[PDB]
mmCIF file with all atom_site columns, C-alpha atoms and ligand atoms in Angstrom:
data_model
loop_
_atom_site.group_PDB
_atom_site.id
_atom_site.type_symbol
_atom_site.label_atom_id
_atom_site.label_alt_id
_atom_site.label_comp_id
_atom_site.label_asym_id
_atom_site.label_entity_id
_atom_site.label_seq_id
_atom_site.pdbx_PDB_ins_code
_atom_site.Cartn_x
_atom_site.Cartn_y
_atom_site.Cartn_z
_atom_site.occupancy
_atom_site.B_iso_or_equiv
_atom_site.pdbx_formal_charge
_atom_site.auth_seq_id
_atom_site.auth_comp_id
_atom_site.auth_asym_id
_atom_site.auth_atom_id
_atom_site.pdbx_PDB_model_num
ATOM   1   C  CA  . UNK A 1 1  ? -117.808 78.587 -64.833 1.00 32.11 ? 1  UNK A CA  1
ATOM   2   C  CA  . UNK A 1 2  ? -116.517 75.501 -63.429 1.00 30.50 ? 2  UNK A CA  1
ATOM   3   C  CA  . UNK A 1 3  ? -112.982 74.452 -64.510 1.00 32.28 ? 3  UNK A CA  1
ATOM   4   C  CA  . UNK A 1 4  ? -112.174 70.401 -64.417 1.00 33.96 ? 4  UNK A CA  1
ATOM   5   C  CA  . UNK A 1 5  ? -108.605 70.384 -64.539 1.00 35.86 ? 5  UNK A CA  1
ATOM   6   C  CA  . UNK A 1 6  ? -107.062 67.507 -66.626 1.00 39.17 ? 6  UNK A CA  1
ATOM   7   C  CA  . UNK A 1 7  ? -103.314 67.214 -67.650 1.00 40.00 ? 7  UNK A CA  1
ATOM   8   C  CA  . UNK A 1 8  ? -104.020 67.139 -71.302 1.00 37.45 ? 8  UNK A CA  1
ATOM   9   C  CA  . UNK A 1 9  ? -106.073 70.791 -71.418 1.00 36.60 ? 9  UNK A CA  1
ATOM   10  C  CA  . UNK A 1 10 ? -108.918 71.878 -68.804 1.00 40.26 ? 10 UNK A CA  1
ATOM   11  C  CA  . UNK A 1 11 ? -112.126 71.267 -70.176 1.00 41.20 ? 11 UNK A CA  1
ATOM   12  C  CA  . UNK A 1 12 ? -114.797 74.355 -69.124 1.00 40.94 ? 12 UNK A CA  1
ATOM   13  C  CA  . UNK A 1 13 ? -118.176 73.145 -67.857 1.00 40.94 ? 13 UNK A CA  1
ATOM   14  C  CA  . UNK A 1 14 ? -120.740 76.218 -68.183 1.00 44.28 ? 14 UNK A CA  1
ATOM   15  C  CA  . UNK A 1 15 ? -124.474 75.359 -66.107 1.00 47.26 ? 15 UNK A CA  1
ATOM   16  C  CA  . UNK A 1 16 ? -126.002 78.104 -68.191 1.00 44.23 ? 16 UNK A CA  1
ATOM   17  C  CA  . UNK A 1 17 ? -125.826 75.769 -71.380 1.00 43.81 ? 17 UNK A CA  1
ATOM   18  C  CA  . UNK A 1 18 ? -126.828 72.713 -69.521 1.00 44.90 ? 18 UNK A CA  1
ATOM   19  C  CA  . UNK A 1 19 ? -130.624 73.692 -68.216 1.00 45.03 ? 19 UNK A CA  1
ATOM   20  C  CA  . UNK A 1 20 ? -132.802 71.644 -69.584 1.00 43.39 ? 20 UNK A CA  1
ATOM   21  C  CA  . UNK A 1 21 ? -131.601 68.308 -69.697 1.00 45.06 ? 21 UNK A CA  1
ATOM   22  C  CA  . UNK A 1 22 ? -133.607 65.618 -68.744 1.00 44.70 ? 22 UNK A CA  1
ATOM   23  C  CA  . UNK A 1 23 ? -133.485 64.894 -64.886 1.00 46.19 ? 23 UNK A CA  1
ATOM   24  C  CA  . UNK A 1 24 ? -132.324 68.434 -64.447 1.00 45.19 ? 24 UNK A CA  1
ATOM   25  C  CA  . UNK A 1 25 ? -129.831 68.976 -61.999 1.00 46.03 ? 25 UNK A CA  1
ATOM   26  C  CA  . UNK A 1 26 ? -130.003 65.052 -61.242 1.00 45.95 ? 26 UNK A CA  1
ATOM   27  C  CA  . UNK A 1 27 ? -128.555 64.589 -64.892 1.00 49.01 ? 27 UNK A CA  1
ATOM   28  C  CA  . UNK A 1 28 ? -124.962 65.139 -63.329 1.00 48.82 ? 28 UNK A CA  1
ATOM   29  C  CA  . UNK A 1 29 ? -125.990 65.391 -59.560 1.00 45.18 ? 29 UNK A CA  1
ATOM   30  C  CA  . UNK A 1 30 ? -127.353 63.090 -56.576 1.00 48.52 ? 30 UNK A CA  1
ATOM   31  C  CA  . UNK A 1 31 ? -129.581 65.579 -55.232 1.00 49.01 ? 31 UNK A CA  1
ATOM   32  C  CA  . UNK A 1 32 ? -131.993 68.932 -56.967 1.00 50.27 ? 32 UNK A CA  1
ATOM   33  C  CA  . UNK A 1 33 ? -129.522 70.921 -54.659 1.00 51.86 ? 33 UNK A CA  1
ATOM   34  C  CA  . UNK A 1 34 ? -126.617 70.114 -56.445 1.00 52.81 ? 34 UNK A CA  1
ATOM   35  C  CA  . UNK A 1 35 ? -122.736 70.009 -55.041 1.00 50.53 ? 35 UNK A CA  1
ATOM   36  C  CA  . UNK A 1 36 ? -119.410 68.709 -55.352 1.00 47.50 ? 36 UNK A CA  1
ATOM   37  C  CA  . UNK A 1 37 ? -119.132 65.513 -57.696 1.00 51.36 ? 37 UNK A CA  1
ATOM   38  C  CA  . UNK A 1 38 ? -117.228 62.948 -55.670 1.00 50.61 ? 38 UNK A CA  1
ATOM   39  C  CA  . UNK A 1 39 ? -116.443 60.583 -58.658 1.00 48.30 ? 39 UNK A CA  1
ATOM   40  C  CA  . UNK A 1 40 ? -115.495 63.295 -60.924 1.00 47.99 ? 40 UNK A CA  1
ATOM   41  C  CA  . UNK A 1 41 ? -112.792 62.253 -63.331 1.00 48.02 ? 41 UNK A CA  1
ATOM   42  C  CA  . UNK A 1 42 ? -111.871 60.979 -66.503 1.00 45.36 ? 42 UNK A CA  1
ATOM   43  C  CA  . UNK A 1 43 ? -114.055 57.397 -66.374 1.00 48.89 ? 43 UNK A CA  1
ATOM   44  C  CA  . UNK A 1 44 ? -116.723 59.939 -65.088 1.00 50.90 ? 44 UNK A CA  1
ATOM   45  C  CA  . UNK A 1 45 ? -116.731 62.353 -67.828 1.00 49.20 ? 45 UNK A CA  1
ATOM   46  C  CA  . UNK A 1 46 ? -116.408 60.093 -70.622 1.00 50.54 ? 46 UNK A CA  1
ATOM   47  C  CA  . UNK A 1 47 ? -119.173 58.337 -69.647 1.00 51.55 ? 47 UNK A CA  1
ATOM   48  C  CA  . UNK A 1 48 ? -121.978 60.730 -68.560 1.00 51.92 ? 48 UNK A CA  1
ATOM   49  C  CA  . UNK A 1 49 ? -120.756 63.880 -70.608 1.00 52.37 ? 49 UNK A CA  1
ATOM   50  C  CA  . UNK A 1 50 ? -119.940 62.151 -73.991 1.00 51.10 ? 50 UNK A CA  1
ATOM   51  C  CA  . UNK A 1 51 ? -122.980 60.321 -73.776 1.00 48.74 ? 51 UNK A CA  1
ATOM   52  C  CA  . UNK A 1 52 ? -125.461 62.772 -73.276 1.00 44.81 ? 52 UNK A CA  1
ATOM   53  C  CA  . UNK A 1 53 ? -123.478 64.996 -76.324 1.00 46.84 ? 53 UNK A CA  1
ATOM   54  C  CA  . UNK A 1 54 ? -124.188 62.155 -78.754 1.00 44.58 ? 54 UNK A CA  1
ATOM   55  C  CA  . UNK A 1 55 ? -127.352 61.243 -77.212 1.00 44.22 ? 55 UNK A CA  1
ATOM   56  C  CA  . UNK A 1 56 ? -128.609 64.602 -78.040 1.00 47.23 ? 56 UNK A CA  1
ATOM   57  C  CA  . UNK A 1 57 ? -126.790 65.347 -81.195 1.00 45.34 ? 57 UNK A CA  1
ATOM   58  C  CA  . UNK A 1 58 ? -125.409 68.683 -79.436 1.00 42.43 ? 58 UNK A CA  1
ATOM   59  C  CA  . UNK A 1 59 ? -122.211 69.441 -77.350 1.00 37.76 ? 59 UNK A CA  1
ATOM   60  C  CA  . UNK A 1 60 ? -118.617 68.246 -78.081 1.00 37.67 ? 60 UNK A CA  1
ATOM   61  C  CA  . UNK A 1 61 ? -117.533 64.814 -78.223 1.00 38.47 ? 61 UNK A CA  1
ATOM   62  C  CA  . UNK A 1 62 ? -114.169 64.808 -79.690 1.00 36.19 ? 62 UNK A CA  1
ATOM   63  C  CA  . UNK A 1 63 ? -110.986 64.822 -77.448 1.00 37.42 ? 63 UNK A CA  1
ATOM   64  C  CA  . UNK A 1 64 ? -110.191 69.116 -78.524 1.00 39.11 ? 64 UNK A CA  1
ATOM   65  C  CA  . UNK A 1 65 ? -113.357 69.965 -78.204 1.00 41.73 ? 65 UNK A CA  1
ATOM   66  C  CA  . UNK A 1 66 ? -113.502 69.479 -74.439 1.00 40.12 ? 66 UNK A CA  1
ATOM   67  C  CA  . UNK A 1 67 ? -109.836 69.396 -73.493 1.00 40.69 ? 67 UNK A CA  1
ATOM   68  C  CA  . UNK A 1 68 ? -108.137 72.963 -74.298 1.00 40.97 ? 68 UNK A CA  1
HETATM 69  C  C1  . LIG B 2 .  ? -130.357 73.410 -61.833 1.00 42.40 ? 1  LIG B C1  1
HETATM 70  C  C2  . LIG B 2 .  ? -129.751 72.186 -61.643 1.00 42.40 ? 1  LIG B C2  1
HETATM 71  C  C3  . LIG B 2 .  ? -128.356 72.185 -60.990 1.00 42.40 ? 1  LIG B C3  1
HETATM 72  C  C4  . LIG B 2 .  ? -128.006 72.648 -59.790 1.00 42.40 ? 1  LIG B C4  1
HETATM 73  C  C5  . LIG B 2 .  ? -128.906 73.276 -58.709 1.00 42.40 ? 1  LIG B C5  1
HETATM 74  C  C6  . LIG B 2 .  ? -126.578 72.467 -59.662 1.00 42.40 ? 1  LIG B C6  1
HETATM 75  C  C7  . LIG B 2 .  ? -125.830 72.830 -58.584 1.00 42.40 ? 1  LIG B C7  1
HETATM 76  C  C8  . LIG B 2 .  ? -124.462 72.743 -58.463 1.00 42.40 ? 1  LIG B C8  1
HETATM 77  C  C9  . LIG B 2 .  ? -123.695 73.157 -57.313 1.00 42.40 ? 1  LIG B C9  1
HETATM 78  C  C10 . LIG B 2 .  ? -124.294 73.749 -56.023 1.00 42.40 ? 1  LIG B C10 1
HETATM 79  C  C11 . LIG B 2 .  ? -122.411 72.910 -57.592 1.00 42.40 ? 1  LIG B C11 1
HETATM 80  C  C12 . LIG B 2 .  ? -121.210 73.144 -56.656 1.00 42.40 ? 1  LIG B C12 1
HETATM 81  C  C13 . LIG B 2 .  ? -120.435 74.392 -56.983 1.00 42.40 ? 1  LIG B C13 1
HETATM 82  C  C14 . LIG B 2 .  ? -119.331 74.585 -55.965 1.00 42.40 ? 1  LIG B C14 1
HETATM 83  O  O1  . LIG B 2 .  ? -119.414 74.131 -54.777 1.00 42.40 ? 1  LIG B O1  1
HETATM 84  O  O2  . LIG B 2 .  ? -118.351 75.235 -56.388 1.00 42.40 ? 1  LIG B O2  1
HETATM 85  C  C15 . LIG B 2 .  ? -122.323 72.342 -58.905 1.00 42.40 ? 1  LIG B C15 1
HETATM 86  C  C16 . LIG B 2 .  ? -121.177 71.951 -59.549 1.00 42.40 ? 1  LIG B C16 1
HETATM 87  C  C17 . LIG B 2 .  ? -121.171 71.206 -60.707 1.00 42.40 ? 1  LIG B C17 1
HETATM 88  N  N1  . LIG B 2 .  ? -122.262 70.840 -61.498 1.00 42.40 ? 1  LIG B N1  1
HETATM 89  FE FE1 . LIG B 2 .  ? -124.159 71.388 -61.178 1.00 42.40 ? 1  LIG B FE1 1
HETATM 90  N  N2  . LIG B 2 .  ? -126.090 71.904 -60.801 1.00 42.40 ? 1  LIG B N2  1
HETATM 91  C  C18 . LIG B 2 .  ? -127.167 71.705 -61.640 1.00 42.40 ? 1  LIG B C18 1
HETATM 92  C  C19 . LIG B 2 .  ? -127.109 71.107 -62.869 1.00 42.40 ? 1  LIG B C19 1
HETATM 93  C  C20 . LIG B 2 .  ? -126.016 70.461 -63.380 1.00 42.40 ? 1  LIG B C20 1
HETATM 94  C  C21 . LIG B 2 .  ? -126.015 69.615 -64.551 1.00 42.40 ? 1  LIG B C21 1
HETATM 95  C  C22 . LIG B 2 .  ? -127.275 69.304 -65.393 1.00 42.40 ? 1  LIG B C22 1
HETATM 96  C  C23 . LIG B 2 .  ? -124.765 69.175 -64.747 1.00 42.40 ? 1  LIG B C23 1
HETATM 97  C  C24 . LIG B 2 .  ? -124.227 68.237 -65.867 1.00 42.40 ? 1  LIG B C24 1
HETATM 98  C  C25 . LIG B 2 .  ? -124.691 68.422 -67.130 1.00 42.40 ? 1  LIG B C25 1
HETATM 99  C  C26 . LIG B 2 .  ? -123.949 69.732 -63.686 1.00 42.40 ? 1  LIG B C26 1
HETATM 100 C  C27 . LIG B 2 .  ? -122.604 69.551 -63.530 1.00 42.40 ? 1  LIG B C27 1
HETATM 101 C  C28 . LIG B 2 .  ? -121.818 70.078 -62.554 1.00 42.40 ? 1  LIG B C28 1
HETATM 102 C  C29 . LIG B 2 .  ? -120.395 69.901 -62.483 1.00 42.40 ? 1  LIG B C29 1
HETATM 103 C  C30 . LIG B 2 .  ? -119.512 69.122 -63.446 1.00 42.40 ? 1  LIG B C30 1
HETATM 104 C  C31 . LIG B 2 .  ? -119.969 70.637 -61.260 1.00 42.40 ? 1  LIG B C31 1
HETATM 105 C  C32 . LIG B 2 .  ? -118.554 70.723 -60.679 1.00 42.40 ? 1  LIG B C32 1
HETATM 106 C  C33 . LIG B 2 .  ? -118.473 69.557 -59.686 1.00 42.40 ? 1  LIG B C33 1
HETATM 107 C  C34 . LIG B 2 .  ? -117.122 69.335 -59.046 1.00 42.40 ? 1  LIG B C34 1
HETATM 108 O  O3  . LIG B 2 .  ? -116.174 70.082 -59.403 1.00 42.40 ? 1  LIG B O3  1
HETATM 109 O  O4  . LIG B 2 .  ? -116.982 68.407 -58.199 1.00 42.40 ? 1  LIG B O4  1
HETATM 110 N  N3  . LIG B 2 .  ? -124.741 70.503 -62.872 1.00 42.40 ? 1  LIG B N3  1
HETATM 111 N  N4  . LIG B 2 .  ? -123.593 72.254 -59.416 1.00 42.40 ? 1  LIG B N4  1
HETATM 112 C  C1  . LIG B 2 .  ? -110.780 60.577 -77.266 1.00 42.27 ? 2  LIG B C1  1
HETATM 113 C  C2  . LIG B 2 .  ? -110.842 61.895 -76.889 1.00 42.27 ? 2  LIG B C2  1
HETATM 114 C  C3  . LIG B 2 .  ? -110.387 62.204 -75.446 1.00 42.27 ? 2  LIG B C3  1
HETATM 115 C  C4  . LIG B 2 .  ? -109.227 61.919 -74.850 1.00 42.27 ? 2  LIG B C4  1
HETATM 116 C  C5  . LIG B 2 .  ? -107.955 61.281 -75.458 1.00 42.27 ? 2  LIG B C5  1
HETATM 117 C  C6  . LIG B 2 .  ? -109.306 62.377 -73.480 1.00 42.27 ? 2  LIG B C6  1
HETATM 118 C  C7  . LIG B 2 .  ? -108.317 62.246 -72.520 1.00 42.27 ? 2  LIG B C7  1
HETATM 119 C  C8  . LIG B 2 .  ? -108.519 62.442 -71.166 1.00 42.27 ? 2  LIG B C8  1
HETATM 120 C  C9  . LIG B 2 .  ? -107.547 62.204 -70.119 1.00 42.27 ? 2  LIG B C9  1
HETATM 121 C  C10 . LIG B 2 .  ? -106.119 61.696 -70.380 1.00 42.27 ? 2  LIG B C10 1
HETATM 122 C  C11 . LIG B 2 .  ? -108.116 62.510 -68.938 1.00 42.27 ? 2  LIG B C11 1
HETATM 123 C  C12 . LIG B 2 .  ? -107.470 62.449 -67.531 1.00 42.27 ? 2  LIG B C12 1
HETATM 124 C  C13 . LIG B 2 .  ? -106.831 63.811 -67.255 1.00 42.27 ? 2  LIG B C13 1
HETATM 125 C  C14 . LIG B 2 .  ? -106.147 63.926 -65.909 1.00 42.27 ? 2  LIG B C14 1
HETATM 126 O  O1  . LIG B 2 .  ? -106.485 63.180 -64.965 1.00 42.27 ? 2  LIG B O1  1
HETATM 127 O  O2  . LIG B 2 .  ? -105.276 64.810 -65.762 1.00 42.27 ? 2  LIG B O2  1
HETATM 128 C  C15 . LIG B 2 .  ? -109.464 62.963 -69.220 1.00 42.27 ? 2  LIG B C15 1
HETATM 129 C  C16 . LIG B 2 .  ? -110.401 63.374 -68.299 1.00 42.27 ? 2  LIG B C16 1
HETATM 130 C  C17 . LIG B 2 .  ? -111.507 64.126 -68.568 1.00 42.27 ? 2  LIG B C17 1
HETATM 131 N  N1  . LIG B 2 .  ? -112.036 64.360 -69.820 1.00 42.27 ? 2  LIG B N1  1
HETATM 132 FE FE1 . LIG B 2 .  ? -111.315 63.605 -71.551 1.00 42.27 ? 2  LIG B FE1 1
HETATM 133 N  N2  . LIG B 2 .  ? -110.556 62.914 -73.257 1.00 42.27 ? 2  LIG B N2  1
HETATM 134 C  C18 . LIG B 2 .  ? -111.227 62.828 -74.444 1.00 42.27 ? 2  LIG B C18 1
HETATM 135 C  C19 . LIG B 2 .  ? -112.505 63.262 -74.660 1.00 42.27 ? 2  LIG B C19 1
HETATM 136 C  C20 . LIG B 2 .  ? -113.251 64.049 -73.811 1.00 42.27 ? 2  LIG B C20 1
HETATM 137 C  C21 . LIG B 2 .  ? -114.476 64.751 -74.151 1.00 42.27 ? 2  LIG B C21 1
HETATM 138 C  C22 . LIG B 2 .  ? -115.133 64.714 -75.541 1.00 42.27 ? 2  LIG B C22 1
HETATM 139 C  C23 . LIG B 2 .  ? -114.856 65.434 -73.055 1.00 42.27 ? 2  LIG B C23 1
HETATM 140 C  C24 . LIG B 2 .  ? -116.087 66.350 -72.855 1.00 42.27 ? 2  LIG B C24 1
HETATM 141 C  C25 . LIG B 2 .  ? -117.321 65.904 -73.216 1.00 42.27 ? 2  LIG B C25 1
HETATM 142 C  C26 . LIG B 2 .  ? -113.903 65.156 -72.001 1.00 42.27 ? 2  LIG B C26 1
HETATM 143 C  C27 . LIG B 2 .  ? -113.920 65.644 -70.740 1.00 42.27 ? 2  LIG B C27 1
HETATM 144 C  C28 . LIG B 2 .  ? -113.123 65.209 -69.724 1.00 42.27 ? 2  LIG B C28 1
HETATM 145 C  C29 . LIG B 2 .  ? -113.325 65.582 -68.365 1.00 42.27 ? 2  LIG B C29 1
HETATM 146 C  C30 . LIG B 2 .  ? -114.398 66.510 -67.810 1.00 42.27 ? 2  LIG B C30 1
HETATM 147 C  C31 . LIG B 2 .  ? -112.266 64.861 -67.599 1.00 42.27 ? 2  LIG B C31 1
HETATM 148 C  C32 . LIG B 2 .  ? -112.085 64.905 -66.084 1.00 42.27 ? 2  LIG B C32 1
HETATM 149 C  C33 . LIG B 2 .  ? -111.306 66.109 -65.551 1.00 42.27 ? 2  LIG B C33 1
HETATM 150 C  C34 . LIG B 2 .  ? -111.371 66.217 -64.019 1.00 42.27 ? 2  LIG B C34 1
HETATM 151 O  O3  . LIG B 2 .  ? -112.176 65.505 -63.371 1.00 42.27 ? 2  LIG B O3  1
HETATM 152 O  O4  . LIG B 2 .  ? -110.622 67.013 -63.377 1.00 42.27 ? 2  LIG B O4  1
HETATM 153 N  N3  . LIG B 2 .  ? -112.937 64.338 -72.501 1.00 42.27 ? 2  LIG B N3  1
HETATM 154 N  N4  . LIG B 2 .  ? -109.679 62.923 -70.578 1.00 42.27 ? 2  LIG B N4  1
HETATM 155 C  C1  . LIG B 2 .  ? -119.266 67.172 -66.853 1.00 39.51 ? 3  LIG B C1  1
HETATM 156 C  C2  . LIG B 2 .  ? -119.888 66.645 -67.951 1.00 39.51 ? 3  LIG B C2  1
HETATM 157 C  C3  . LIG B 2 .  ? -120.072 67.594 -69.154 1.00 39.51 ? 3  LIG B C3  1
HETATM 158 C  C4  . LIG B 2 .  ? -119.184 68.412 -69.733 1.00 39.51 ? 3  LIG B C4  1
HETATM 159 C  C5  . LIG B 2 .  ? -117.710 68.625 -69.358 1.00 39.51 ? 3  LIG B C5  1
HETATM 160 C  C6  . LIG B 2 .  ? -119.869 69.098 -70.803 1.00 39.51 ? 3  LIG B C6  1
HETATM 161 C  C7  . LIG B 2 .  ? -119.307 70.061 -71.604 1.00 39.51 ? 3  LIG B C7  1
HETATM 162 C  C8  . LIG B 2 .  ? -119.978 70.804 -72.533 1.00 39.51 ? 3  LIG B C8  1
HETATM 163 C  C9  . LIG B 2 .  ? -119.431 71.899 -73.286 1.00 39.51 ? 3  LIG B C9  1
HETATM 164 C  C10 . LIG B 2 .  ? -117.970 72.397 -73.161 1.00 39.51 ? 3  LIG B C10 1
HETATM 165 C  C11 . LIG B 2 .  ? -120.399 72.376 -74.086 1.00 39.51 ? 3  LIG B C11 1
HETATM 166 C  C12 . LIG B 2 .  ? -120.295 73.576 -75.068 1.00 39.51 ? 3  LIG B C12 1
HETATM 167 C  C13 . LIG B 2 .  ? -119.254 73.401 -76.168 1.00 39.51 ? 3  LIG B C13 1
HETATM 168 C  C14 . LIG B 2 .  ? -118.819 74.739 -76.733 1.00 39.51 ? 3  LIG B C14 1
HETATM 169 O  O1  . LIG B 2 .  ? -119.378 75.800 -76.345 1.00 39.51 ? 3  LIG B O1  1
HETATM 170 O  O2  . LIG B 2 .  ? -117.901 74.762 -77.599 1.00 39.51 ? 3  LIG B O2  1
HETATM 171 C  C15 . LIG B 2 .  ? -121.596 71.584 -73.839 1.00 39.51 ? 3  LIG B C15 1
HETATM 172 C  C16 . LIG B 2 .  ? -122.808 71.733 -74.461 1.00 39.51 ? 3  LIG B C16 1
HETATM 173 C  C17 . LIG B 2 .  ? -123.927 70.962 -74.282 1.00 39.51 ? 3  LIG B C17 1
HETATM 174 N  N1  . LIG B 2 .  ? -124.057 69.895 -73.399 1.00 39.51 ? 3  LIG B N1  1
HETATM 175 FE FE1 . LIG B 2 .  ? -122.610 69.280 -72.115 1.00 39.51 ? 3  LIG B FE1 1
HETATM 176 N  N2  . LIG B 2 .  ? -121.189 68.657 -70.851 1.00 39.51 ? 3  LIG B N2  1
HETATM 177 C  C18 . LIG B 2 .  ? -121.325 67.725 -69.864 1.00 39.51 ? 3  LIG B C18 1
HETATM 178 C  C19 . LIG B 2 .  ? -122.461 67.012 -69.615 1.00 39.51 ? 3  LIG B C19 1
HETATM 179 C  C20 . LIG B 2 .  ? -123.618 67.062 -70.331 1.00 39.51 ? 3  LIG B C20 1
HETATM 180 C  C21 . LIG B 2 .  ? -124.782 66.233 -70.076 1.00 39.51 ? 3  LIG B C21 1
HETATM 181 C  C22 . LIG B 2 .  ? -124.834 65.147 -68.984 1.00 39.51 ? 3  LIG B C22 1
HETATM 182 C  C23 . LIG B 2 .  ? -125.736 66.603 -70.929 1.00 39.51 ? 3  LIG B C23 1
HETATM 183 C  C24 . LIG B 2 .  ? -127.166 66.021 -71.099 1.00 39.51 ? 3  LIG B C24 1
HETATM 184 C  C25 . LIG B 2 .  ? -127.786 65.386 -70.056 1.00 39.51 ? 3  LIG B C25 1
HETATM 185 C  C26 . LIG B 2 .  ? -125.164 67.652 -71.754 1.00 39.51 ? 3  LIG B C26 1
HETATM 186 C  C27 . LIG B 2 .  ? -125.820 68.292 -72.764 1.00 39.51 ? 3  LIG B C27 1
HETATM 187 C  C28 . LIG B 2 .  ? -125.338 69.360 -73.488 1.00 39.51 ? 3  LIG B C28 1
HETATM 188 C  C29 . LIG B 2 .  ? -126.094 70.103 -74.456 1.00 39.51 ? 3  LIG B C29 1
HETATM 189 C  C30 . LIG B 2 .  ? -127.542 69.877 -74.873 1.00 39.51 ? 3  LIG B C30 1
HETATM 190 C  C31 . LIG B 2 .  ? -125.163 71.158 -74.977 1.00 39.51 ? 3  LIG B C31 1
HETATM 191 C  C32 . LIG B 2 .  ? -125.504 72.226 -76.014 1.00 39.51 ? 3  LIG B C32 1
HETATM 192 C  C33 . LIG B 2 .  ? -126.076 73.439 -75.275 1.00 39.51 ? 3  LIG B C33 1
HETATM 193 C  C34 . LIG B 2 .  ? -126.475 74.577 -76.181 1.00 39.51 ? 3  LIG B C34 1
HETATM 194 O  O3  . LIG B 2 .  ? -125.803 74.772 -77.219 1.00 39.51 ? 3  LIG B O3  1
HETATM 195 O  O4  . LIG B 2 .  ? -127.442 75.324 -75.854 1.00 39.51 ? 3  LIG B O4  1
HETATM 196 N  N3  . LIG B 2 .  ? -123.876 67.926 -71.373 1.00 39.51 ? 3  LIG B N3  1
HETATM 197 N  N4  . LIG B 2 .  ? -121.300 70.637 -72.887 1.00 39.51 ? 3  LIG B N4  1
#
């Protein structure tokens, strides 16, 4: 798993639960090869991971839920 560190509790991002999305891989990355995420961070996350959670009605979008 990938662990994004953040000062208030690491929040655990897991690629198995995240095939298919729409866009695939280009849902969170530039390219279908995938990589590092340059802008990672908190404006970052709470854009593009709460919004797909409450886009789809699945996944966690209160503060706990992600930050442990
Ligand atoms: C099958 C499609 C995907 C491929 C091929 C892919 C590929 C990759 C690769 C190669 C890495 C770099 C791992 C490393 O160097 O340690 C990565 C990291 C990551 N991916 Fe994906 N990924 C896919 C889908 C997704 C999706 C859909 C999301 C978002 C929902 C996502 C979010 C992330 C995040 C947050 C990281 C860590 C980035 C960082 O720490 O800078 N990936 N992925
Ligand atoms: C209102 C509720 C939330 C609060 C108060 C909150 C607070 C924060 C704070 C203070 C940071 C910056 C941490 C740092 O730089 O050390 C951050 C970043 C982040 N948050 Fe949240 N957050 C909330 C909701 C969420 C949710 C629901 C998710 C998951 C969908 C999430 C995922 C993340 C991620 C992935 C980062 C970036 C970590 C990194 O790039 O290393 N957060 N958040
Ligand atoms: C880096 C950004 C993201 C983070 C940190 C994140 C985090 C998470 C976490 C922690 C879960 C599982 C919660 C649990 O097991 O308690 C989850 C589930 C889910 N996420 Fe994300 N997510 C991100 C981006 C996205 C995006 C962009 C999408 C849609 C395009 C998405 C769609 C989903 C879906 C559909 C689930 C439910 C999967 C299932 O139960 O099979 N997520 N996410």
């Amino acid at each position: 798993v990938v662990v994004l560190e953040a000062k208030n509790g690491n929040v655990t991002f897991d690629h198995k639960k995240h095939a298919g999305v729409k866009g695939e891989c280009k849902a969170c990355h530039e390219t279908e090869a995938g990589g590092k995420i340059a802008g990672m961070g908190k404006d970052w996350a709470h854009k593009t991971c709460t919004g797909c959670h409450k886009e789809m009605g699945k996944g966690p979008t209160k503060c706990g839920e992600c930050h442990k």
